[PDB]
Amino acid sequence: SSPVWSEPLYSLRPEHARERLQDDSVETVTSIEQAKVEEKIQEVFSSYKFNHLVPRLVLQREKHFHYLKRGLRQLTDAYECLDASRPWLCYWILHSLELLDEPIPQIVATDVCQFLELCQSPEGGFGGGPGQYPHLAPTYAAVNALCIIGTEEAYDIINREKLLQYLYSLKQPDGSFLMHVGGEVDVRSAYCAASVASLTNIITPDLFEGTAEWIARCQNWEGGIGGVPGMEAHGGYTFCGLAALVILKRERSLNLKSLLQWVTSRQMRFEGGFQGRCNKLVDGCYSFWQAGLLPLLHRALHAQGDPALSMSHWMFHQQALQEYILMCCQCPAGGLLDKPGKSRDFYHTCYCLSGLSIAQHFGSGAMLHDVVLGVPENALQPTHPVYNIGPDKVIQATTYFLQKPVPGFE
Amino acid sequence: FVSLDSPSYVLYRDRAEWADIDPVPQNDGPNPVVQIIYSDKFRDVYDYFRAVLQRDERSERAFKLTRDAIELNAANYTVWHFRRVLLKSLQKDLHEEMNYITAIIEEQPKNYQVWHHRRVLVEWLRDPSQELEFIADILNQDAKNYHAWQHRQWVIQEFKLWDNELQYVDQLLKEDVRNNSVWNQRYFVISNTTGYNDRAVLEREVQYTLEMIKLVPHNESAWNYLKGILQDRGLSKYPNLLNQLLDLQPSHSSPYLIAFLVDIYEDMLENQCDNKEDILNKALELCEILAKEKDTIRKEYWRYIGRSLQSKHST
Numbered sequence A: 001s002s003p004v005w006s007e008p009l010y011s012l013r014p015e016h017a018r019e020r021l022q023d024d025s026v027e028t029v030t031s032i033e034q035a036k037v038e039e040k041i042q043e044v045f046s047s048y049k050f051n052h053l054v055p056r057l058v059l060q061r062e063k064h065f066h067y068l069k070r071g072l073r074q075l076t077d078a079y080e081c082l083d084a085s086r087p088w089l090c091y092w093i094l095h096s097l098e099l100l101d102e103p104i105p106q107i108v109a110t111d112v113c114q115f116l117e118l119c120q121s122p123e124g125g126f127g128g129g130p131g132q133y134p135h136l137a138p139t140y141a142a143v144n145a146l147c148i149i150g151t152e153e154a155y156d157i158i159n160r161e162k163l164l165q166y167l168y169s170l171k172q173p174d175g176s177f178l179m180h181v182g183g184e185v186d187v188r189s190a191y192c193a194a195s196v197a198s199l200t201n202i203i204t205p206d207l208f209e210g211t212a213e214w215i216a217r218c219q220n221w222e223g224g225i226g227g228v229p230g231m232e233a234h235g236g237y238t239f240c241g242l243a244a245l246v247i248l249k250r251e252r253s254l255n256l257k258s259l260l261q262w263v264t265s266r267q268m269r270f271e272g273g274f275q276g277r278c279n280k281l282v283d284g285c286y287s288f289w290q291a292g293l294l295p296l297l298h299r300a301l302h303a304q305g306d307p308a309l310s311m312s313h314w315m316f317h318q319q320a321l322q323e324y325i326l327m328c329c330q331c332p333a334g335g336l337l338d339k340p341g342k343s344r345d346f347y348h349t350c351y352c353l354s355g356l357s358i359a360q361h362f363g364s365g366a367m368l369h370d371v372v373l374g375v376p377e378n379a380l381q382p383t384h385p386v387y388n389i390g391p392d393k394v395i396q397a398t399t400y401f402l403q404k405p406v407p408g409f410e
Numbered sequence B: 001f002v003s004l005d006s007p008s009y010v011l012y013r014d015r016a017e018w019a020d021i022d023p024v025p026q027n028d029g030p031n032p033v034v035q036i037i038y039s040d041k042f043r044d045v046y047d048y049f050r051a052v053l054q055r056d057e058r059s060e061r062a063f064k065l066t067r068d069a070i071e072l073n074a075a076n077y078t079v080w081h082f083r084r085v086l087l088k089s090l091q092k093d094l095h096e097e098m099n100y101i102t103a104i105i106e107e108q109p110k111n112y113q114v115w116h117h118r119r120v121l122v123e124w125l126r127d128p129s130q131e132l133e134f135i136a137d138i139l140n141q142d143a144k145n146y147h148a149w150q151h152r153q154w155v156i157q158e159f160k161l162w163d164n165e166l167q168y169v170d171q172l173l174k175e176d177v178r179n180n181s182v183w184n185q186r187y188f189v190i191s192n193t194t195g196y197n198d199r200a201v202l203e204r205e206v207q208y209t210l211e212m213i214k215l216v217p218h219n220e221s222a223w224n225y226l227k228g229i230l231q232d233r234g235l236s237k238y239p240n241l242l243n244q245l246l247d248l249q250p251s252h253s254s255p256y257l258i259a260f261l262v263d264i265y266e267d268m269l270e271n272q273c274d275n276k277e278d279i280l281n282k283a284l285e286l287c288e289i290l291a292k293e294k295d296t297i298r299k300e301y302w303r304y305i306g307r308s309l310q311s312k313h314s315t
């Protein structure tokens, strides 16, 4: 085989050069941008190869840890643009630490709980900051962050009675949900609502009436799912759509065949990472939004008794994705990102790591098969494909809330 | 009146017309987390925004204040909501607000709140007269802006402005035939106007698409559109397509053409095609070629397809 200190990489094989873009001698803005990214990526790939010597890839854990630890406390005015998304910051940072298996100090856990309590609206749900109106995005984030902390103190912060009333106040006749009072509608709302409602055990028979059908209407000719019916398929909205349907146990409302073919086609033959939609660029966060669809599809098909499903791998190139993330998405100063040349941010740090974890761990029934590229320490903690928080946190939260009644319903 | 960057801008805590109201600081608790160290100007505006919001003051001064709050953070949906509450309470001129939102979106086209605000205004006015032209300008700067296309589909469908969209689609495809957002708009327009059941329309679309494929063999969008308009009826229902793609294979053996062939074979086997054994063998051979040579990034997918075919048609 190979000595333990050298590990051959897919992106470094000589045949890989044949995966470069073929523009058929017809240039358009799209091909020009794609070629520019590929050129930069090839340079990056090459820097990890020294002829036959190919050192193991390293996830810079400690650098990422220090970046995250600092952000959980304070941020410069450069973050003013996220003043209405603070619970998101709590979630992205806590989940990244969780994936990196970095314990959350008791004092920090308590402070986060207190802060999220201040973000909770008296009408139910959470806002982007203290005193802000509730919104499904920060609500989704706050609930996930509280579940990651997983203490009864954290669980009890959530006003379940008002949360359910709030969800009702956003529910539309056609099955969709507004993102907030007087707000816009797109599939993100359905996922945020389904996620927090299932985790906190507040789902009623009528809450999601028509929702599955509305989501199905969002799947388009491409096979993926758009923000609203008629719109272009996008990884972000496709994750939201399928994950919400899995929670509702209505995945079969979709054409899983066209969806599977669509998402697998979103992995870039050259870069190894995923693009958000056909003919657009590779981006580290799609390592989760797109690749995360494979574990969901696997479970969906498995429930149908598909005898052709793999018992050891997800239906995407697990190694190639790990190569893209490890070689192209790490900021040497800590944190992860979209692609080489972009600046780090907590959002991409969260999803690049979440995608890396999905790429490293396969699990179906009693079957478990890990593929950890690089040094062994690269292995991250597993993440739940539906909620994107540790599966241990999902079990503990659902178990806790299941012991409580659905607010005013029997 | 005066902008946040204007040389004569004055902090709200220094404005005499605001002296009667006390600012409301943001309470982040004793031991804050994800605490943003705001600039003096940012905090100043939001301390007063919190004050008017708390007192639910429907005034002209509060209205002007939201404009500054928005410039500081256009993603603050709470400010946007309040502004709309004020637009109604103060009976503000909506055409004036339309000019405002137009400038804002031009500056920040990738923001959910600005597009939603514009949609609400158009809904209140029931006036879409400026929409298609404004959107076209945004798309002229970024031909794939998701929010722009979504807003465009809404306006067209809500106000029935289908008449010239196919021409618009054709123009953008000429500019960049790889623009997947435009191919999506193409399906959107046709499915909602003539539909694809009209065999003359379908033929026109298949010929158009095939022609684009010949021009740019490796453009995935065209291939996806071709499959998209034929998949519901079933790819095996179009016998001539198989032969035509089979004739191009030798000179255009791109993974897209090879994959399309497998898709056709899959459907044929699902419809009791003749010579099942022969079709199955050809499909499995292509799956192996794709998995091992032509489309290795999707090897797991192609191996799955190979196994599915055998579980369904091996007999």
Ligand SMILES: Cn1cncc1[C@@](N)(c1ccc(Cl)cc1)c1ccc2c(c1)c(-c1cccc(Cl)c1)cc(=O)n2C
Binding pocket: A082, A085, A088, A236, A283, A285, A338, A345, A346, A347
């Ligand atoms: C489209 N996209 C792809 N990668 C990042 C982005 C994104 N444009 C974005 C926009 C909307 C949504 Cl719902 C999700 C992602 C984007 C880009 C950069 C971003 C953020 C978001 C976000 C962000 C802010 C609020 C919510 C969400 Cl989900 C993400 C934070 C941030 O620090 N940075 C630098």
Ligand SMILES: CC(C)=CCC/C(C)=C/CC/C(C)=C/COP(=O)(O)OP(=O)(O)O
Binding pocket: A137, A188, A191, A192, A234, A235, A236, A237, A240, A275, A276, A277, A280, A281, A283, A289, B144, B145, B146, B147
């Ligand atoms: C739960 C939740 C809130 C999920 C959100 C998922 C997600 C990533 C949505 C993105 C939607 C969007 C408007 C993309 C366009 O940005 P772009 O044009 O910059 O994107 P692109 O070039 O990558 O397509």
Ligand SMILES: OC[C@H]1O[C@@](CO)(O[C@H]2O[C@H](CO)[C@@H](O)[C@H](O)[C@H]2O)[C@@H](O)[C@@H]1O
Binding pocket: A216, A217, A218, A219, A220, A221, A222, A223, A224, A253, A254, A255, A258, A259, B191, B228, B229, B231, B232
């Ligand atoms: O991926 C196609 C698949 O999606 C469904 C919805 O689950 O319909 C979508 O695609 C059709 C074109 O194939 C459109 O006519 C329809 O509007 C869109 O929602 C399935 O019916 C189809 O098999």
Ligand SMILES: [Zn+2]
Binding pocket: A283, A284, A285, A286, A338, A348
């Ligand atoms: Zn991204």
